Design a protein around this ligand. Structure first.
Ligand SMILES: CC[C@@]1(C(=O)Nc2cncc3ccccc23)CNS(=O)(=O)c2ccc(Cl)cc21
Ligand SMILES: [Cl-]
Lengths: 305, 305
């Protein structure tokens, strides 16, 4: 029993965190084999950040201008290339603690763990989701840049995110490990705004299935709905459109609890129109949307790495 | 900016997780130097659990009756003593990954990270608090016994908990790393009931101070209160009695925001009265009580908004 927001064990990722210093700027780097990966905004000053020319700024820096530090040991940079918005620093020494890894670009609604670091030193780990508006509601202070988002599948760490900047509304924006931003964001000092967010419908549904598994059945009713009638209501409450793929993915949960996906959709429809009414599902007065159908099956089965 | 429930990086604790097997039973163990620590109910059967005589059951066991397994390698037990409710297995190999550690007994209202394991294999990490009724609302399935609660302050891992059992209401009971239970609980399958829980007042207060630091002030009012008048009202909403120690501990936060502790108490008194009224403090429709005054100072910046 029990339902908590859980993150993957951060150990494999902790062994990859280094501190990258370039002039006055100091952020975090990801050391895998003989390459350190970090935001390309490390070469930038606060003057350069308005309209930067990253290729012109990189052609001027030599290897020793970048001080990479792994714990108490210094690392020797022997090369520097750039891939989109990530700077790839070839180092002399291969990381002996390199885990089995992959670089993956995740889709909105998919969750990941964030190992928040400051000066190459891990300080915390938390779980979060890629919002429909490509932002992440993370917890970051200055100097957290270069912190990574990951998921472990068996013994393989799948790197899916690197922190770059925080938006004016308190939300965060970063890139996949290939430098490609998540969303309509750019790495520079400009008027950037987070779009209108939506609730991840397939995750709320999965979280209600976890509540039924954990003994909460008060929100269930005898009624069901058509996928179309559900989507019209969902659209009115800023919910993401539920697709036939979403329905199929909730299949294992539907079979385990004994409540059809469109039966559970009707419970959610009535929770949107009428509310909680002083009650809580899984200890929450809000409908939680950062638990994917896989996350629920993992926590309510016991998958080990 | 940003406020999330954060857990400590689990890496230092991952390297200590072994699998303890004694006959048909298999739970988790904590391997520090040449000692493996695990629940003493590993020696028990489901028959023995009603009224076990642990001394009589241990004297019938030889070192080979225990199979400790560290990853793919088998460990050789060369001793077996018992300390309260924890079984201490002397092994023939010291853990090369033993971190700098301490054993600490925490008090209610304090928070810690939990590395949930199954068959010595870490599967997830989450943050939780020692409830006023000595239980923890964790996320544990069968076979998670022996999972530990920790706090990593600086480079030292402070071990404060070991999972022993799950009560009928779905809450969890465990011991400190010396085998001493938290609460009026016994490692016996008897009619044990979790006491009436209360909200941790000093943590809700700290969480409101973090909201003020992060820019929210809607909940504040012009009223103030006496410590006594606050406690009478608090006890009505099942809130923990606020003590003069609690007030002092909130001192640094009181100075940083510029809102006296009894001023913040009167904002909470009103919040308990009218409720949220469709609004949220730090992204929550409930008053969060699993952030200690120390957690808030740790996570939040010194720059108030
Ligand atoms: C022998 C362990 C056991 C237990 O609670 N196991 C568990 C621990 N944590 C999560 C669980 C989730 C589901 C199933 C069991 C869980 C078994 N139940 S009992 O009442 O006999 C019992 C009584 C006292 C002690 Cl200290 C242990 C135990
Ligand atoms: Cl304490």
């Amino acid at each position: 029993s029990g339902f908590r927001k859980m993150a993957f064990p951060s150990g494999k990722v902790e062994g990859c965190m280094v501190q990258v210093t370039c002039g006055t700027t100091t952020l975090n780097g990801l050391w895998l084999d003989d390459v350190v990966y970090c935001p390309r905004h490390v070469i930038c000053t606060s003057e350069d950040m308005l309209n930067p020319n990253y290729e012109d700024l990189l052609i001027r820096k030599s290897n020793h201008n970048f001080l990479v530090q792994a714990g108490n040991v210094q690392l020797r940079v022997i090369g520097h290339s750039m891939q989109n918005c990530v700077l790839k620093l070839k180092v002399d020494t291969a990381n002996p603690k390199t885990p089995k890894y992959k670089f993956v670009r995740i889709q909105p609604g998919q969750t990941f763990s964030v190992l928040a670091c400051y000066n190459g030193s891990p300080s915390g780990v938390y779980q979060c989701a890629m919002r429909p508006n490509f932002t992440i509601k993370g917890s970051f202070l200055n100097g957290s840049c270069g912190s990574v988002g990951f998921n472990i599948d068996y013994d393989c760490v799948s790197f899916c995110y690197m922190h770059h900047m925080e938006l004016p509304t308190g939300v965060h924006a970063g890139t996949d490990l290939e430098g490609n931003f998540y969303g309509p964001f750019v790495d520079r000092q400009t008027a950037q705004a987070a779009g209108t967010d939506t609730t991840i419908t397939v995750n709320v549904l999965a979280w209600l299935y976890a509540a039924v598994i954990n003994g909460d059945r008060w929100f269930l009713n005898r009624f069901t709905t058509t996928l179309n009638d559900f989507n019209l209501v969902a659209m009115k409450y800023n919910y993401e459109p539920l697709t036939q793929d979403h329905v199929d993915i909730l299949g294992p949960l539907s079979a385990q609890t004994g409540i059809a996906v469109l039966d559970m959709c009707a419970s959610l429809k009535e929770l949107l129109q009428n509310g909680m009414n002083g009650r809580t599902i899984l200890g929450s007065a809000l409908l939680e949307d950062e638990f994917t159908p896989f996350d629920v099956v993992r926590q309510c089965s016991g998958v080990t790495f």
